[PDB]
Amino acid sequence: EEIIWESLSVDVGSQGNPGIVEYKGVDTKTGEVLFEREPIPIGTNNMGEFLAIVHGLRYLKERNSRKPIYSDSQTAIKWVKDKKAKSTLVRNEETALIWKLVDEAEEWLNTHTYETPILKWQTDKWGEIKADYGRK
RNA sequence: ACAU
DNA sequence: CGATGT
Ligand SMILES: [K+]
Ligand SMILES: [K+]
Ligand SMILES: [K+]
Ligand SMILES: [Mg+2]
Ligand SMILES: [Mg+2]
């Protein structure tokens, strides 16, 4: 504890896992939706969580914002730290789009710098992350 | 087991 | 119940 309210919170939403994947980022303090990705026909929860963080990094950098990012995903936080999304999802024609986006997100991480702290949202203490889709 |  | 991940 406690919550850094001056922050950006991100989350994935899906229909199936693997299944249709989307994500969004919100102002933690107000819940204002700041970005939303068009649904991607097949992906995994963790791919979406990863893309959401990287999109947040790009969004904040473009706006010269030093706010931290909250994610509830232990997995995605680690993938971003490593600059490598270690997904098990088969690479085939059906999954080409999500894998293109993941590949491109890794590529962005490997060609840009950032100081943005990427913080674990402590769901057990604070409840659902403010970017949550409310589907569970 | 923990995080989804 | 099923799945994705460390
Ligand atoms: K949800
Ligand atoms: K959660
Ligand atoms: K498991
Ligand atoms: Mg989440
Ligand atoms: Mg959620």
Q: At what angle do helices A45-62 and A74-82 cross, to 10 degrees?
A: 60
Q: How far apart are CA A24 and CA A76, in angstroms?
A: 14
Token couple for A126: 């604070």
Residues contacting nucleic strand C by the 7 Å CB criterion are A 17-18, 44-47, 74-75, 78-79, 86-89
- Distance, angstroms, CA A65 to C1' C6? 30
Q: How far apart are CA A134 and CA A107, in angstroms?
A: 31
Give residue A27's Cα distance to chain centre. 14
Closest-approach nucleotide to residue A43, Cα vs C1': C4
Exp. method:
X-ray
Q: Which CATH architecture has domain A1-136?
A: 2-Layer Sandwich (3.30)
